[PDB]
Each structure stands twice: as structure tokens, then as C-alpha cells.
Design a protein around this nucleic acid. Sequence first.
RNA 1: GAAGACGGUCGAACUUGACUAUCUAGAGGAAGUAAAAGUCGUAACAAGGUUUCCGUAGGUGAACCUGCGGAAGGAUCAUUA
Length: 99
Amino acid sequence: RELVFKEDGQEYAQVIKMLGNGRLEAMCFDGVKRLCHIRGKLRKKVWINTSDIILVGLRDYQDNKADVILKYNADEARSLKAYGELPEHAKINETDTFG
RNA sequence: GAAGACGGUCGAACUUGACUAUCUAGAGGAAGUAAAAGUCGUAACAAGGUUUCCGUAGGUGAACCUGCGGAAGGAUCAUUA
């Protein structure tokens, strides 16, 4: 509904391996692998898929854990990409809902 | 009557070896437990769709199946001269 951007302690990541036990692996836009955690509103109200644009929170004393906040589906994700936040090597690969 | 010496006894300890109680690393690999969403299939609970279970043996990705002998914790307390 609204375009909210990243802040201090938050960034964007791409889901690489979709696991169980309410956690997943996401590749952050800084160049490090992290074990993210599914938020309490993100278990069943929304469904997180692979290769999607998500909001990932930083951890200030350990640097191998994270947690996920939001999810951008198609148009706000491509509008955020048009603004410029990521290295251009990463590929969207047309992330949206299929038919 | 001192130092010293042979022999005997008690005897700490040393060197060559074995046994030995506990702790700390260890490639390799099989296990158990706690995690809201991974994959395959549906074994069990209603006759769960092949009734379940026990002992033994073989089989197969996985739950699992089959042969032999028992149990009712069975869906039968009973089927007529």
C-alpha cells in the first residue's frame, strides 16, 4: 500500500534455499550468507517464496543470524529497483504470482 | 679411645619392562533430542478402505509386505435335527 524503504539495521535480500522449521536462507545485498528467521506475522498470514525481494533486519552483536520483515511482490519491487539500491549483477528473474 | 673397613638387618630411591584408575585431541560414521511452514508416499486411529498385535525368517527408496504359529486388546459372548 505504501513505499517503505530500508533504514539503519535493515536491508534487502534474495531467498536462496527455502527450508523448514520457520526459517530460510537469504543472500543479503552486502555479500554475506545469513540464516534468517520467519517473523511471527510471517508464518501463515503471508507465504515467502524463492528469489523474492524481502526486508531483512540486521543483528548488532552476531553476524550470522537475521530476521525477515516484509515482502515486495512485483511492482513496488521493480519501482524500488528503478530507484537504485542493489548492485546490478543481481537478477529479478521476473518475480510475481504465476497463472 | 677418633677416622676408616669386611659382614648382617631396617630401608628412602634410581635404571631397564609389564599391568594399571581418571581427564584432555582425534580423519572416518552410526545414533538420540528441540525447532510454525522442504521432498516423496499414506503405514496406524471408523471393517482406515488388505482387521490390528506378538514370536521368527526373508524381502524392498521410505513408512512398509509376505510365509509359519498364536492373541482378542475383534466388526462375533448365539445360529437351531
